[PDB]
UniProtKB/Swiss-Prot annotation:
Protein name: Zwei Ig domain protein zig-8
Residues of the full protein shown: 23 to 137 of 268
Compartment(s) where it occurs, according to its Swiss-Prot or TrEMBL record: Secreted
Biological function: Together with zig-5, required postembryonically to maintain the position of ASI and ASH head neuron cell bodies and ventral nerve cord axons of PVQ, PVP and HSN neurons by preventing their displacement that could occur during body growth and movement. May act by reducing L1CAM-like protein sax-7 (long isoform) adhesion.
Domain Ig-like C2-type: 18-106
Distribution of this protein across tissues and organs: Expressed in PVT neurons and pharyngeal muscles.
Lineage of the organism: Eukaryota, Metazoa, Ecdysozoa, Nematoda, Chromadorea
Sugar-bearing residue positions: N60
Gene responsible for this protein: zig-8
Outcome of gene disruption: No visible phenotype. In a zig-5 mutant background, 74 percent of animals have cell bodies of ASI and ASH head neurons displaced either on the top of or anterior to the nerve ring. In addition, double mutants show defects in the positioning of the ventral nerve cord (VNC) axons characterized by axons of embryonically generated PVQ, PVP and HSN neurons from the left and right VNC drifting into the opposite cord (axon flip-over). Both defects begin at the L3 larval stage and become more pronounced at the L4 larval and adult stages.
Domain of life of the organism encoding this protein: Eukaryota
Cysteines engaged in disulfide bonds, as pairs: C35-C96
Membrane spanning stretches: none
């Protein structure tokens, strides 16, 4: 597209993004955004909704008051942002930012489809 392209252009990293960069889901179903954490760097990650600049989570803790969001540790190097019930209003760009020395940013586009 170009919505998705402009979102991926916000990626700032030395290493190629090893997690999915495009997530399509059907509305009212769970979505899962994965972020790969450099294991020789400050392991702190925050999720950011680009549309309104909302800081959703900033590590193991949630900042948004929409209870459909949760952050979890899937593996030693992979964090998951769980969107419990995706709506058409949830489609758009999301940023995983790592407080490593180089300020690594990864970009994930969520597209929710409503039948
Ligand atoms: C993140 O959550 C896990 C549980 O999955 C916990 O074991 C770990 O200590 C937490 N880490 C931080 C940095 O808060």
């Amino acid at each position: 597209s170009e919505e998705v392209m402009a979102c991926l252009r916000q990626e700032r990293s030395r290493v190629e993004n090893p997690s999915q960069t495009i997530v399509n889901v059907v509305a009212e179903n769970p979505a899962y955004l994965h972020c790969s954490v450099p294991p020789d760097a400050e392991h702190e990650i925050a999720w950011t909704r680009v549309s309104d600049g909302a800081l959703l989570t900033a590590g193991n803790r949630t900042f948004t008051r929409d209870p459909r969001w949760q952050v979890s540790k899937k593996s030693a190097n992979i964090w998951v942002l769980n969107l419990r019930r995706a709506e058409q209003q949830d489609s758009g760009c999301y940023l995983c930012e790592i407080n490593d020395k180089h300020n690594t940013v990864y970009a994930v586009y969520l597209k929710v489809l409503e039948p």
